[PDB]
Amino acid sequence: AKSKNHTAHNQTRKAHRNGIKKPKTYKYPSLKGVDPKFRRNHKHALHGTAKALAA
Amino acid sequence: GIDHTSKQHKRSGHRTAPKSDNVYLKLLVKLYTFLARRTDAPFNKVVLKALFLSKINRPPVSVSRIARALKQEGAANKTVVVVGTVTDDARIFEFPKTTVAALRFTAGARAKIVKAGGECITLDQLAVRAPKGQNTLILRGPRNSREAVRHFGMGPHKGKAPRILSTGRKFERARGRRRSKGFKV
């Protein structure tokens, strides 16, 4: 007994019931995948400027 | 026929009354319902909504959290308002002389506040003193520290706790959790 193989019928209508969410944007995006050499120095740069404003 | 752009007969989704049957709680709701209607003060509306919250949405606020809030610049002589329970905290050794208004005080929390010269009052006494919420600080406890939260959103590469009864060497530390056994998450 052969049956249906594949179809995309009704799939777009299901997607538009609640979906198609535009991605939310955050200030300060995560630094995942950034060059490690840049991240090591930027950590030290942030530490130094903390003391300048604190003092 | 109408081509509706939104769902019909949709409820607001916000509590408009307490779920409980406490007679005294309904009296406080009746008092602040009147105040919120005829004072145009944002403090009264916030308190009225907070009285409808369930138990998980009203975490306890310890006296140490109260003491830290009073260390804010210019907040030393404000009345701390907690719509919920105030618990005791022995990790702190010095307590100021503030005034705290809360629904409930534990025996330890009440003793510590009174010992330092402060007073513990109810929310209806607060309304007489500050009908418009003058010189008030609203403190809320932590919601995400609840033990049930750490299991929400479980999945690969999510870093969430699994729902498990026994924790140990032989309980969910094999294949799927280390590269030596198939793969790691």
Binding site: - | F93, M154, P156, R163, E172, A174, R175
Partner: protein, 148 residues
Amino acid sequence: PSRFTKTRKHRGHVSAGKGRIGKHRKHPGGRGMAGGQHHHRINMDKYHPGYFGKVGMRYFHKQQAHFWKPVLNLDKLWTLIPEDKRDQYLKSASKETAPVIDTLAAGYGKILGKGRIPNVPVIVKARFVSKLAEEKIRAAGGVVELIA
């Protein structure tokens, strides 16, 4: 109670909420944890990673009593002194009158240092102590006495 269940509301609705097509059969999919690696793998790989396999080394005839060692942090060290005596010790911080705390008698095995204690000397007796816990105790003028 039975009168509040949805069974009462399903009276007169044929399928009792189980559907007409799928129906409510005996055991579709097997019993218990059946098919954990074949047709329930997805639900096992997520929500339960690490279930299949073995990791550590065995331990024949393990007795839990050998590993009894409750931990107490420094931020709760003064709770072992009864409240009616805490106040006089805090205001009279001096040598030759340091209170003695027996953590073992209170049911603790090791003292860990997390919080901050007042600058008051105290004599702490314990079976075990962490390096940081001893330093904070001695910084306040106290001492740790090892016991068994």
